[PDB]
Design a protein around this ligand. Structure first.
Ligand SMILES: COc1ccc(S(=O)(=O)N(CC(C)C)C[C@@H](O)[C@H](Cc2ccc(OC)c(Cl)c2)NC(=O)O[C@H]2CO[C@H]3OCC[C@H]32)cc1
Lengths: 99, 99
């Protein structure tokens, strides 16, 4: 779709068999989701945002369906204010900004 | 134009005659700029992201040119690593996210 920005660009995602809501976030390099259980092995990682840094669990090669589009890639899990879909997966679903 | 998300979607902006680089950010409600001295009244604000909150100065009705597209509205100024163009101004330049 063509997503306008008068409201937050929130979409439904499916991950680990669960439906969740996430923010399409062009300002994020990486995808970060709120605390949840995910199948594979994970590695401790750090990521930083506007307020500083947090500890996350890094899961590699995870399937996520984003508004009906499949991506398979790295998902970080930790204390984020909201689920955010970053460029690592936005690129997989062919997303661009235009104006 | 069509901005790719292979890299950070940075574009040139102009505010108060100053030329800067900023992120076109669908995940930001508001526009946040790196610390700079602006004249005029402002209002204290706190905004939150992945590391917690930071204190910013809120300036209203500020003119900002984004990749040659003029916009006017609220700008937040504080200790951010990067200049962030949020939805309050992205909507004014007719930006959409497409996939
Ligand atoms: C009320 O107005 C606002 C409120 C919050 C923000 S936010 O910057 O925290 N953020 C919100 C989001 C986390 C829910 C916008 C987001 O795009 C942010 C911008 C940024 C903030 C700080 C930055 O430098 C550390 C950068 Cl490069 C982008 N990106 C972000 O936190 O991304 C994380 C996940 O991927 C990595 O890549 C960039 C940072 C890491 C902006 C405006």
């Amino acid at each position: 779709p063509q997503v306008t920005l008068w409201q937050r660009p929130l979409v439904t995602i499916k991950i680990g068999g669960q439906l969740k809501e996430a923010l399409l976030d062009t300002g994020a390099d990486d995808t970060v989701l709120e605390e949840m259980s995910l199948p594979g092995r994970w590695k401790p990682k750090m990521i930083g945002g506007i307020g500083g840094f947090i500890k996350v669990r890094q899961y590699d090669q995870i399937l996520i369906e984003i508004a009906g589009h499949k991506a398979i890639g790295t998902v970080l899990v930790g204390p984020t204010p909201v689920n955010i879909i970053g460029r690592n997966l936005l690129t997989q679903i062919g997303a661009t900004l235009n104006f």
